Design a protein around this nucleic acid. Sequence first.
DNA 1: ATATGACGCT
DNA 2: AGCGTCAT
Length: 430
Amino acid sequence: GPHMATGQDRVVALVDMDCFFVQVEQRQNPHLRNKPCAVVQYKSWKGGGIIAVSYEARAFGVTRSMWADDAKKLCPDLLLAQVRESRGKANLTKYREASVEVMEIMSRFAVIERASIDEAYVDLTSAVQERLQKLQGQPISADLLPSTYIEGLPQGPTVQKEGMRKQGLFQWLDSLQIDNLTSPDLQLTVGAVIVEEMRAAIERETGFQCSAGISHNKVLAKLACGLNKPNRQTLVSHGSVPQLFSQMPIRKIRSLGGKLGASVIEILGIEYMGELTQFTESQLQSHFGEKNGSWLYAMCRGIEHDPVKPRQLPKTIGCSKNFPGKTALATREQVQWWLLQLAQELEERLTKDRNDNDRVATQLVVSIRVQGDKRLSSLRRCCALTRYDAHKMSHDAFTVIKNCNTSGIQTEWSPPLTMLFLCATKFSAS
DNA sequence: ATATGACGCT
DNA sequence: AGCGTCAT
Ligand SMILES: Nc1ncnc2c1ncn2[C@H]1C[C@H](O)[C@@H](COP(=O)(O)NP(=O)(O)OP(=O)(O)O)O1
Ligand SMILES: [Mg+2]
Ligand SMILES: [Mg+2]
């Protein structure tokens, strides 16, 4: 009771760009704005693969990993932008650079952990504290929170979305104990005020809109973010968790979206996150291991301790390309030529990285997939990365994978390769 | 024929 | 080290 952990020590946010690659293309081409549109990779095979979808297009049922020709059947007006292709492969430079625009703005407010090309976690605890001392006793106006939803509100004793949003915000703000500078609810609220500012600054300075979640940990923050996308932010309080988790499918929670989550469901015979509470920590550990049981026990009560890692820059720099179906590489010449293509892009980005972030990669990981094998990687090998030179890197990469070739004929490659992947890792200061 | 990046397990 | 899991 009086010694029970409640996981309310931190204020953490997750900011995620709304249909990010689409916004990047739409900024550059005003014709795409306010229109159903998608970003497509390649063109030949069925119009190309869709990897990002505007919300206008989503209303038609257009989704990621849909072929462009199929998307057009759902949405004939659909506008497309193609990913740049360089040396026969997708070149994502424009989105990486757009990403850096956003991460630099967020970094001004607090420490961020880059979690993907289009999202970062923020530890706002310190900023909230200071903002709270600069704002002693001053009540928080709803005007400071113009795009914020309070999850679970309004409750108890209007038919418009914005009307609902405001009612809940009013109920929340009326109930706040403003004199207590250690109230977790107040802290979150102040956290939300800062995130409004962060999000205003991102949009002012990039043109890009985003959503955000504000809570006490990463998992709740990430979950919160998705509840009112696009162009809105959501506060998930500790108190909101029992009802939210009561009908929350286990798979929605970060890290439970795969086999572990399926296993939780299967072995325990449950569906929703809240149902985990009726198990002891030891029961959970016995089914899912010491680490997982401990984590599940706390998480189903809204408690999670994974820290926001102070890291704005990726730890590996990588290049990959699949070679599906008929296009699978089957000669030594093909393999070597594509290793060179991959290595050349990698060199470009490594060189850029060394100038920009004052570090040098020191290990090259080569990964291939072979025909028939469904795993992401059939095989990973590594060598030293001593010189930022594509020819050396590609030759080195061939060297450490060439014995994977089961072919009697020297000019042929079997089994055929369906993926090549070069990844520079183990960075050192420079 | 669904380009990358982080991390856990052994 | 090399593979497995989960993610955008
Ligand atoms: N499986 C994948 N494969 C290739 N590219 C991908 C990808 N998933 C995402 N991308 C690229 C394309 C995406 O634009 C970008 C961010 O991914 P999200 O945040 O998951 N989705 P978005 O920001 O588009 O929409 P919203 O957040 O509003 O739901 O990463
Ligand atoms: Mg996004
Ligand atoms: Mg994202």
